[PDB]
Amino acid sequence: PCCEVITNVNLPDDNVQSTLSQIENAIDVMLGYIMSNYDYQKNLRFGGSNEAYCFVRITSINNNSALADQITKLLVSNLNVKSRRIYVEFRDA
Amino acid sequence: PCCEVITNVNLPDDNVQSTLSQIENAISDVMGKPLGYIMSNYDYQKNLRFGGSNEAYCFVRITSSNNSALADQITKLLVSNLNVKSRRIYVEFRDNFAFSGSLF
Amino acid sequence: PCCEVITNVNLPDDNVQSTLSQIENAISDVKPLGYIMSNYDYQKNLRFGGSNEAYCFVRITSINNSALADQITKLLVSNLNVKSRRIYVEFRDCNFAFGS
Numbered sequence A: 001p002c003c004e005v006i007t008n009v010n011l012p013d014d015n016v017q018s019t020l021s022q023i024e025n026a027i028d029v030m031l032g033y034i035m036s037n038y039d040y041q042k043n044l045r046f047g048g049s050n051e052a053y054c055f056v057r058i059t060s061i062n063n064n065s066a067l068a069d070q071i072t073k074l075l076v077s078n079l080n081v082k083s084r085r086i087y088v089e090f091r092d093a
Numbered sequence B: 001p002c003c004e005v006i007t008n009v010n011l012p013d014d015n016v017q018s019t020l021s022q023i024e025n026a027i028s029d030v031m032g033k034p035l036g037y038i039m040s041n042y043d044y045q046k047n048l049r050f051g052g053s054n055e056a057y058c059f060v061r062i063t064s065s066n067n068s069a070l071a072d073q074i075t076k077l078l079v080s081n082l083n084v085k086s087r088r089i090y091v092e093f094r095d096n097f098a099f100s101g102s103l104f
Numbered sequence C: 001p002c003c004e005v006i007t008n009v010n011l012p013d014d015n016v017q018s019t020l021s022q023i024e025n026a027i028s029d030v031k032p033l034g035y036i037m038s039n040y041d042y043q044k045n046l047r048f049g050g051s052n053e054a055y056c057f058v059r060i061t062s063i064n065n066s067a068l069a070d071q072i073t074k075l076l077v078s079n080l081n082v083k084s085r086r087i088y089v090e091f092r093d094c095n096f097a098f099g100s
């Protein structure tokens, strides 16, 4: 398992860790072997714009709607970002 | 589609954004792909090395012919804007379920 | 050819460069190292197993993989003070590149 949030929204660490932990919980849908990360990229753009944006890559679930939906609420509510500016990719050592 | 510039060259944000914006234009122009529907990013990695050396360097990943025109175009932008030798610029084209958050 | 170490272990730059250089050697031992990238990406909030304790993800792109993995794992265990349970090594064999 692996989850990466890539975003230009700056959160304090305590808040980042809550969010990552909440996403791990979600990622019920299908643990002690998982790697999550919040990668702060201030210059990240989408739609020709550097406004708040988050890209989520989940590697790994087939179910996938439940996870996407769940994550999208977490990030809208914890990152104060418009849900139009959330993209969730699922890729399925 | 997605362009990521990965580099140990530190630029101020205003400059980073100009560059990213110029690159988006290029992708759109040279490939005819829908502008706006692109990610770009500038990932500052100070300890990034190439050839056993931490000197100025650019890795450009383009994910998801005409391609020479694009590579060339980008290479000038980064040479100009980053003051990096073109002998330290590499431009890599590389290649599942997807959702927008408005669907929820 | 490319190695990226992704980790929440903060090292000073001189140390980071030594390690990256030691990894380049390894990759080279087990072609030559002038057509090769490496990087140390510090991600402080990186987690594994629900925990933000020390950890290393290594992605190796475009390259007896066991010899390389084993070698790198010792380097990182030694130089990052991380448990080897908390080190994972992926190889990707994923197309073209284009200055000089």
Ligand SMILES: COc1ccc(-c2cc(Oc3cc(C)cc(OC)c3)cc(C)n2)cc1
Pocket (backbone or CB within 6 Å): A001, A002, A033, A034, A035, A059, A060, A093, C048, C057, C087, C088
């Ligand atoms: C035998 O080769 C393998 C072994 C394990 C995986 C694997 C690894 C996965 O995630 C991780 C992620 C991280 C950080 C560590 C890990 O194990 C140490 C597994 C998730 C899935 C679904 N598969 C993939 C290939």
Ligand SMILES: COc1ccc(-c2cc(Oc3cc(C)cc(OC)c3)cc(C)n2)cc1
Pocket (backbone or CB within 6 Å): B050, B090, B092, B093, B094, B095, C001, C002, C034, C035, C036, C037, C062, C094, C095, C096, C097
């Ligand atoms: C999946 O997209 C990809 C993946 C790998 C490459 C690639 C990667 C290569 O590795 C490198 C990387 C670097 C920094 C220098 C280099 O010397 C040419 C080769 C070489 C070639 C011919 N192609 C190009 C595109």
